[PDB]
C-alpha cells in the first residue's frame, strides 16, 4: 500500500483548502502523503483573497484582509482518498465535492415517515 | 344574549351555556408569510385540542362526563362554591398546578375503557 | 414506560397499548416557505387519516371494531401468530397488497349501516 500526493488539477482540488481566521488557505499536503506502507511535518501554504466557492462560476467574492497574525488549531478527523489503479495499490488525496464532507457526518441518520393506520384480524364484531 | 367572552365574568354554572359562542371563534411576500403563519397556527392549535378530547373519549362534545374521580387535594370545595360563586378565570388559576395530572388520568381511564369494550364484543 | 416508537420492535399485542404515544406525535422568506410547507403538510396528512376513520365509522377511536369479516386469503394465520409473534412492521409488509381492498370494504359496510340506522328511526 503506497501513498502518493495529489494529481494535477486546479489549486482548489490539488491542495488542502480551508478557511480559518477569516482567510483562505491552500496547503501543500505532499509532505503527508509520501510513503510506502505506513519533530513535525511542515506544510507550506498559499493564500488567496479572490474566492470562487464550490464549483460555481459567476459569483466571486473578495475576502477582506484580517489585521494582525492568524493562528488556528484544529483536529484532522478523517481523509478523503482516491485509489489509483497488480501487487500494489496507490492512494492519493481526493476531494472537491462538498457533499462528501457532510456525508461523513450524516451517515448515521435516516428519515422515515410514520404511517399510523393499520388493520388486523381480531375476534370481535361491532 | 351575550357575545364572545361575554360570560367571562359570570359564574361557572352561568357560563358553560355559552360554550358554542367561544368554540366558534377559534375557527409583499413577507407580509403574506406573516398572515399565513397566523392562519396555520390557528389551525394547529385547534387540532391539538381536538386530538386531546379524542384520546379522552370526548370527541364531538362540548360537555363530557368522564369516569375519573375528583381528588379533594386538587380543590377542596363544594359544588356550591365552584359552580355558583367562582368564575372560570378564577378556577383556572386555582387548579393550574393539577392540570397535567388530571390530563394524564383522563388518558389512562380511556385506554382501559377502550380495551374493556373490545373484550365485550 | 417507552416513548415514541419504543414499541416498534414489540409484538402486535404488546404494542397497541401505546397508540396514544404515536398519535400525539402526529400533531429569508424562502426559508419561511419551506417551514410553512412542512407545517401545512403535517396538517393535511393528519386530516386525511381522520376523514378516513370517519367514513368507516371509527371517528374518535384508537381501536375500532368493525363489521367486516376477515378473508383468510388476506392472511391465513391464527390470532396467536398475529398478536403474539409478529410485530406491526412485519404485519404491514405481509398484507400490503390487500390494504385497498380492505379499505373499500370498510367504507361499504358503513354506508349500509348508516342507512339501516336511519330506517329504524
Amino acid at each position, epitope marked *: 500500500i503506497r501513498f502518493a500526493n495529489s494529481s494535477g488539477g486546479d489549486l482548489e482540488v490539488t491542495t488542502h483548502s480551508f478557511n480559518c481566521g477569516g482567510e483562505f488557505f491552500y496547503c501543500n499536503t505532499s509532505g503527508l502523503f509520501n510513503s510506502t506502507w505506513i519533530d513535525s511535518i511542515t506544510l507550506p501554504c498559499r493564500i488567496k483573497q479572490i474566492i470562487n466557492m464550490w464549483q460555481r462560476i459567476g459569483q466571486a467574492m473578495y475576502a477582506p484582509p484580517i489585521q494582525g497574525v492568524i493562528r488556528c488549531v484544529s483536529n484532522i478527523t478523517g481523509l478523503i482518498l482516491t485509489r489509483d489503479g497488480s501487487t500494489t495499490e496507490t492512494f492519493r488525496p481526493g476531494g472537491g465535492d462538498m457533499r462528501d464532507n457532510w456525508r461523513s457526518e450524516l451517515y448515521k441518520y435516516k428519515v422515515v415517515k410514520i404511517e399510523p393506520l393499520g388493520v388486523a384480524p381480531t*375476534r370481535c364484531k361491532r | 344574549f351575550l357575545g364572545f367572552l361575554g360570560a367571562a365574568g359570570s359564574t361557572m354554572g352561568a357560563a358553560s351555556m355559552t360554550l358554542t359562542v367561544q368554540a366558534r371563534n377559534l375557527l409583499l411576500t413577507v407580509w403574506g408569510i406573516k398572515q399565513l403563519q397566523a392562519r396555520v397556527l390557528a389551525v394547529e392549535r385547534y387540532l391539538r385540542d381536538q386530538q386531546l378530547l379524542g384520546i379522552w373519549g370526548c370527541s364531538g362534545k362540548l360537555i363530557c362526563c368522564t369516569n375519573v374521580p375528583w381528588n379533594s387535594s386538587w380543590s377542596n370545595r363544594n359544588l356550591s362554591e365552584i359552580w355558583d360563586n367562582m368564575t372560570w378565570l378564577q378556577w383556572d388559576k386555582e387548579i393550574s398546578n393539577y392540570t397535567q395530572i388530571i390530563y394524564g388520568l383522563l388518558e389512562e381511564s380511556q385506554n382501559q375503557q377502550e380495551k*374493556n369494550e373490545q373484550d365485550l*364484543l | 414506560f417507552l416513548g415514541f416508537l419504543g414499541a416498534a420492535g414489540s409484538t402486535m399485542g404488546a404494542a397497541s397499548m401505546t397508540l396514544t404515544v404515536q398519535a400525539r406525535n402526529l400533531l429569508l422568506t424562502v426559508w419561511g416557505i419551506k417551514q410553512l410547507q412542512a407545517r401545512v403538510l403535517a396538517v393535511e396528512r393528519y386530516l386525511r387519516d381522520q376523514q378516513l376513520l370517519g367514513i368507516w365509522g371509527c371517528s374518535g377511536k384508537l381501536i375500532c371494531c368493525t363489521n367486516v369479516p376477515w378473508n383468510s386469503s388476506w392472511s391465513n394465520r391464527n390470532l396467536s401468530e398475529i398478536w403474539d409473534n409478529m410485530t406491526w412492521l412485519q404485519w404491514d409488509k405481509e398484507i400490503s397488497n390487500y390494504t385497498q381492498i380492505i379499505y373499500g370494504l370498510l367504507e361499504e359496510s358503513q354506508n349500509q349501516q348508516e342507512k339501516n340506522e336511519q330506517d329504524l328511526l
Partner: antibody
Amino acid sequence: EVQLVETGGGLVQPGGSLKLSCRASGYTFSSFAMSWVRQAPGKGLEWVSLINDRGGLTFYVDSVKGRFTISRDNSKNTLSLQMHSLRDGDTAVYYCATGGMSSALQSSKYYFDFWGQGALVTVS
Amino acid sequence: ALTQPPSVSGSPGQSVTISCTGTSSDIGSYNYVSWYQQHPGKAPKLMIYDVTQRPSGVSDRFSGSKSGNTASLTISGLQADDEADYYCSAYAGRQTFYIFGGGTRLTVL
C-alpha cells in the same frame, strides 16, 4: 403442572359474610380469565362468577348478583370471592377454575381448563 | 339447564354414549359444549372442549359431537377407571354464561 389452591373459612352463620381466596402457580396468572363454580353437596355444578384476565370485567349468576364480589390481584397471583348475606342455599364446595372467557386478541375458550380442589363452605 | 339424569353403563371393552340435551338459544346455536369428569371427592377434569376437541393428556377413548340441540360424549374402549360422574356444560350467551347438566354416573360392568 399448575396449581390452584383454595383457602378460606368453611363455616358461617346465615346473614354474615365470608371471604374465599385462590392462590395460583405454574402458569402466567395474568394471561387467563378465571371463575368460580359451586358443587352442591348432593348435586351438580353451578357457575357463579367470572372475571377477566385484567380484572376489569366481572360477571355473575343472578342468584348472587347483588351479594357476591369477585376480584383479582395479578401481582400476587390470587383470586378472591367476597360473599355477603349468605343463605343456606349457598352451602357448597367452591372451586377455583381457570378459563371461562377470552381476550379478543386470542383464541376463545368458553370452557374451564384447570380446577382447584375446592373450599367447603357451610352456612348453618 | 341441560339434561341427562339417569346412570349409564357397560362392560369393559363396550362403548357407551352419554347424552346432553338443551334448547335452541343455548346448546343448539353455540358450539361450545365441554365435558368434565369427576371422580367422587375430587375436582372435575376437562375431557372435551368446544365440541369434539380434547385437551392434551386426554386419551382418544374420549370423543364427542352434537346434532340439533343434543350433544353427546362417546367413550369407546371402556375401562374400570372410567367410573366417574360425567357432566356437560354449555355457553349459553351473554347474561347467562354457563349452564351445566346434572351428572351421569358411569358404571363399568
